[PDB]
Design a protein around this ligand. Sequence first.
Ligand SMILES: *[C@@H]1O[C@H](CO)[C@@H](O[C@@H]2O[C@H](CO)[C@@H](O[C@@H]3O[C@H](CO[C@H]4O[C@H](CO)[C@@H](O)[C@H](O[C@H]5O[C@H](CO)[C@@H](O)[C@H](O)[C@@H]5O[C@H]5O[C@H](CO)[C@@H](O)[C@H](O)[C@@H]5O)[C@@H]4O)[C@@H](O)[C@H](O[C@H]4O[C@H](CO)[C@@H](O)[C@H](O)[C@@H]4O[C@H]4O[C@H](CO)[C@@H](O)[C@H](O)[C@@H]4O)[C@@H]3O)[C@H](O)[C@H]2NC(C)=O)[C@H](O)[C@H]1NC(C)=O
Ligand SMILES: O=C(c1ccc2[nH]nnc2c1)N1C[C@@H]2[C@H](C1)[C@H]1CN(C(=O)c3ccc(C4CC4)c(OCC4CC4)n3)C[C@@H]21
Ligand SMILES: [Ca+2]
Ligand SMILES: [Cl-]
Ligand SMILES: [K+]
Ligand code: NA
Ligand SMILES: [Zn+2]
Length: 806
Amino acid sequence: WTATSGSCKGRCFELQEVGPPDCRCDNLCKSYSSCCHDFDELCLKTARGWECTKDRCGEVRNEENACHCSEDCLSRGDCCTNYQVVCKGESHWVDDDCEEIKVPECPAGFVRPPLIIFSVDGFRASYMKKGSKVMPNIEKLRSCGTHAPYMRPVYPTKTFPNLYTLATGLYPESHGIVGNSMYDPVFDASFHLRGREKFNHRWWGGQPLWITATKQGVRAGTFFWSVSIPHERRILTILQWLSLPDNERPSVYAFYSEQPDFSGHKYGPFGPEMTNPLREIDKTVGQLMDGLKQLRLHRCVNVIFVGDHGMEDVTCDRTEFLSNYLTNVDDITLVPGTLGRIRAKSINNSKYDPKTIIAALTCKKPDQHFKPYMKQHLPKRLHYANNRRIEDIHLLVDRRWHVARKPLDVYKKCFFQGDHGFDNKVNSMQTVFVGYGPTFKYRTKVPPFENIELYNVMCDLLGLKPAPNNGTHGSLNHLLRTNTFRPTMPDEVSRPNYPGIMYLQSEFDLGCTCDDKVENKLEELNKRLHTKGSTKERHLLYGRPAVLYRTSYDILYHTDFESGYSEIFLMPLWTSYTISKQAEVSSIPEHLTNCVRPDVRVSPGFSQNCLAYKNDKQMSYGFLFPPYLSSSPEAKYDAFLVTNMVPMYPAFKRVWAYFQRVLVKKYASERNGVNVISGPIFDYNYDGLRDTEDEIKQYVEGSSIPVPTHYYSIITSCLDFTQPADKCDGPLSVSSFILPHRPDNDESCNSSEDESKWVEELMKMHTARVRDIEHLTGLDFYRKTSRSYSEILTLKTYLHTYESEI
Ligand SMILES: *[C@@H]1O[C@H](CO)[C@@H](O[C@@H]2O[C@H](CO)[C@@H](O[C@@H]3O[C@H](CO[C@H]4O[C@H](CO)[C@@H](O)[C@H](O[C@H]5O[C@H](CO)[C@@H](O)[C@H](O)[C@@H]5O[C@H]5O[C@H](CO)[C@@H](O)[C@H](O)[C@@H]5O)[C@@H]4O)[C@@H](O)[C@H](O[C@H]4O[C@H](CO)[C@@H](O)[C@H](O)[C@@H]4O[C@H]4O[C@H](CO)[C@@H](O)[C@H](O)[C@@H]4O)[C@@H]3O)[C@H](O)[C@H]2NC(C)=O)[C@H](O)[C@H]1NC(C)=O
Ligand SMILES: O=C(c1ccc2[nH]nnc2c1)N1C[C@@H]2[C@H](C1)[C@H]1CN(C(=O)c3ccc(C4CC4)c(OCC4CC4)n3)C[C@@H]21
Ligand SMILES: [Ca+2]
Ligand SMILES: [Cl-]
Ligand SMILES: [K+]
Ligand code: NA
Ligand SMILES: [Zn+2]
């Protein structure tokens, strides 16, 4: 109940929220059905439209007008945005040459350049090029300010998850808005688009920019606008707030456009009907920049023009029906469309089985346009698992398709020709970023980056300390002229041991054998040099990774590779080796097929044993540094040390063997040498973070050998591929992956074929940032390079996506 009998007289678009039952006058009252009776009359004037005309100049102030062309309007803060153009001979902002903004040029009383966030729903990245003719205001911001070719959204590439990711710097799994539609089993409550539950605070985790600002004494405009408030009125309101007295004036503002998403759903991303919504957005931008110029703020305010996600061609005839796969179709609840999430219709049903649902959905039709995953098996780069609101069963839908439960859902729920929500590496889902103002750089293009990074930068723009988030603070410093945040490397927590030869062969009882008993100070001084690190500058190019947690581990040197060996997990945390373009691949000699060798530097008690592998009928083993890439027959023996071994399912060994035998050499050939860092990952609670030893759910049978959930590699070379990886003078180039360590290859529908038909496609799907691997391992890489730390942070956030040119 609201006793809506008060008045908005003098309170239009008030910044403090009045509590029930007094009536409201803020930009959200409509959406709560809580505005005072006179809100429309006083606060939503429309008379005479939004533009001054010649005849209105110098007019006598008529307070009924939507905006004003009277002489007093500049000082009252409420001229039409084109007032000075029509009545005072001025030019439109878009018509002025751009001139570098070297310092903020603000009116007296401004303590800091304000930030305006201009957010556009469904603004696909290629609109910047393809629509450039009809968007001159936006094209000016883009070419005069700082821009990226595109910005990567978060998964799912839906509206609320992405807007709230922009506001918080957090993955949806952490902020809690995990889709446009959700069920929370703990609340026993549902979040929907239409309806009131979505207004309850309990859905919204983390700490959005407006709250960060408020707690630190920086005032915020209210970010959200009722849909029926027209764009012109939104702009006029922001401009009025900017004329408030110093003590009352917010420093951060948000504008939101429902376009072009709204039309894109109806007409497809490039429908001929899309030109007009793009014109109209541009016109709104022009109105803002003209209004800023009138207020002498166009060289003071930082403006961010940012999208939430793109838009793909999607139609009713491209829908897959779960009723074509499942017999039990009425025992499930599906969240449908461009992604799928499945749960049981009823908790009172114990005949519900996720494993049989998954099997019934796996590789059932030749051209099948979705793939089922248990959420913990989704690509780690999606970070889409660690929330009770994300259903255990997930379907990744092919770009251009929908999944639905039954055909009746699609005709009794074609209309739409566009949609979004697909995998966040899909080109059609990419969106835009432009920054313009004194704090951004002048005429600068920066590489594509992820929307999770923006919250830190928005904090930097406003002098705020960001709340803990998933951005990597400093990785976007290269967007900024000043206000950079100067990050430092984290301190190493554990220092390694450097064990020498400490054990005799016969102290080991590991059940391992090797045919290695074949026998010269020329070559014997040499191998001692190798074991003390004589070739370490070749194989460890960026310094050893730092261990950022308390643990016990040993550095182990070898001719061809160096490792950080964990006495706790009984295997390396990392193995580092360099493969030059000229390197040669060899086979495992016949006599050495099953060879495993005790490491005389490492105690029996801190070693794996071969017997456990013999007895564990499911589990086999592989090696981190591959025997195939040994520099010589004698160096090959090192690759068979028990300290280079790691547990692998035979099914996974097919993937791993192909990567090590075929793909490493191919990368070295194409990139002019590569440095490789590989290792295990343990993330049994699927939280994106390194497991402690007490979290491991699986061991090699009869042993303390923990089974990794994933294996990673980080493959680095010189960005200037004319320089070899081991002699690079400048910036680096990286690609990485986090392969799920699975007992089957059900994920790959073509896995019955030769590895050359399916393995690389699997690896591509599991591409990762170095930063994702850092979180999963508690390691910190690239500690010793010639590069600046901010540049290294940018490199660590890089994702190699394998999509073609945008
Ligand atoms: C991306 O960035 C984010 C943000 O930095 C990273 O997330 C952080 O990770 C931390 C480690 O997992 C986590 O720290 C824990 O916080 C617990 C207190 O949590 C509350 O307070 C914070 C701070 O204000 C708040 O943000 C939290 O909000 C969560 O929950 C609410 C409601 O439940 C949601 O609205 C909100 O969206 C958010 O949800 C997300 O996080 C939670 C985990 O907290 C998930 O469960 C959700 O799915 C969702 O993803 C909370 O309101 C604190 O209690 C923890 O301490 C335990 O463990 C430590 C070990 O150091 C130990 O000292 C304690 O004893 C304690 O153990 C006890 O509890 C155990 C579990 O109940 C039990 O087993 C034991 O026996 C003990 O009784 C811990 O410090 C931090 O909260 C989140 N922050 C956020 C915002 O999510 C994220 O990791 C990054 N991702 C990547 C890949 O890097
Ligand atoms: O009709 C829709 C809609 C639109 C497109 C769709 N495609 N598929 N289904 C769809 C449903 N919607 C979603 C919401 C609401 C109603 C609109 C207004 N809005 C905010 O007002 C806001 C909501 C949430 C946030 C963030 C999450 C708090 C925000 O922040 C903007 C600043 C961060 C830049 N603004 C975002 C849109
Ligand atoms: Ca974990
Ligand atoms: Cl959703
Ligand atoms: K075995
Ligand atoms: Na398969
Ligand atoms: Zn949409």
